[PDB]
Design a protein around this nucleic acid. Structure first.
Length: 135
RNA sequence: CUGCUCCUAGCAUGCUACUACCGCGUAGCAUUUCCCAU
């Protein structure tokens, strides 16, 4: 089992000297430090995942829920959506990660380039008729 | 991961201005040559 940790930050003295020279950080002044790089020990990833225990099953009054969703639909009446093709897509910052499988071999740019437009069109059409669980 | 902004570099396009040459087109001015047999 892995045990991930978060190492502290790095200090930058010369700015601190330049600031304290101009009369800063004196006692009683209405300004100080309340933002730091907090350190994290070992078993912290699990103890953070444990906060999901606050999710509980819950019913909702179906009648007023239907009415409220009707009104909220009435809110969003000034836009437009629809299916597009792989050519019309726009992607920003492709050089970033991609999941559990696939994070070992390049980044999203690799898979984006490696597949033609017909590959993406077929993949999109496939999901409209199946279910693909992921991690 | 989405949105916003800065900066830099490159490209490409569009548009504007300037410079040169060209030819055209027009106008003006002026000249140079001047012709013969089967």
């Amino acid at each position: 089992v892995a045990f991930q940790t978060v190492k502290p930050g790095n200090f930058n003295k010369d700015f601190y000297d330049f600031a304290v020279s101009k009369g800063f950080f004196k006692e009683g002044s209405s300004v100080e430090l309340k933002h730091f790089f907090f350190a994290q020990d070992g078993n912290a990833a699990i103890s953070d995942y444990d906060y999901y225990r606050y999710n509980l099953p819950t019913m909702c009054d179906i009648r007023q829920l239907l009415f409220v969703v009707e009104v909220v639909d009435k809110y969003f009446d000034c836009y437009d959506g629809g299916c597009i093709n792989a050519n019309q897509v726009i992607v920003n910052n492709l050089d970033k990660s991609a999941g559990f499988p696939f994070n070992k071999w390049g980044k999203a740019r690799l898979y984006y380039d490696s597949m033609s437009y017909e590959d993406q069109d077929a993949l999109f059409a496939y999901t409209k008729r199946n279910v693909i669980p992921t991690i």
